[PDB]
Amino acid sequence: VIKPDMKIKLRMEGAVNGHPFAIEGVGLGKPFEGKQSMDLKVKEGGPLPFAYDILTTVFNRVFAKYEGYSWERSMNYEDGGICNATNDITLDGDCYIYEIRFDGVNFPANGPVMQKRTVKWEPSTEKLYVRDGVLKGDVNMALSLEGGGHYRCDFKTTYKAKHFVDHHIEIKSHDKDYSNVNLHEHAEAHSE
Ligand SMILES: [Cu+2]
Ligand SMILES: [Cu+2]
């Protein structure tokens, strides 16, 4: 029911520090090869007044090597910024559809997110475990900063269907104000 080549269509509606925006994207990935890529367009609220990197992990764990589901996530940044995100994932033929909501608050004006001083997420390892019959996933994430140094964030995801996973996520290309972004992720699961 999961095919070697699958398409992705997503819409994100969100806000950061009260400023609303929306983004649409199309892409394709290889579930069993643990690869995906996509092109993302800002439809509303552009040009975004915050670092695009806080969105990238929100833009599917089926894309990982060795009815649908949904997930909720909290991303707690070390300087007090909090982001909540959800994704409802459904399957339509050979096409995954993501309905995504994103909401961030309390990012300081002088911090690296609002001043767009972030470069990339360092590769990470998500720890997945079951609790109350649903799957949780925690990870310490870190954004690399332009002036050297790192910006810590704690991720807490709940997966709900209707070991480790190594992640690497890169923005391969973007225009000046990030209205267009090409985004790429690899992911493998392991254990012991
Ligand atoms: Cu760049
Ligand atoms: Cu690649």
TrEMBL record:
Domain of life: Eukaryota
Binding-site residues for Cu(2+) 2, renumbered to this chain: 184, 186
Record's keyword terms, sorted: Chromophore, Luminescence, Metal-binding, Photoprotein
Residues holding Cu(2+) 1: 174
Any one Pfam family match given in the protein's UniProt record, by short name: GFP
Sites of Phenylalanine amide modification: 59
GO BP: bioluminescence; generation of precursor metabolites and energy
Matches recorded under SUPFAM superfamilies: GFP-like (SSF54511)
Keyword 4Fe-4S: no
One function term, GO molecular function aspect: metal ion binding
Family designation: Belongs to the GFP family.
Name listed for the protein in its UniProt record: Fluorescent protein Dronpa
Species assigned in the record: Echinophyllia sp. SC22
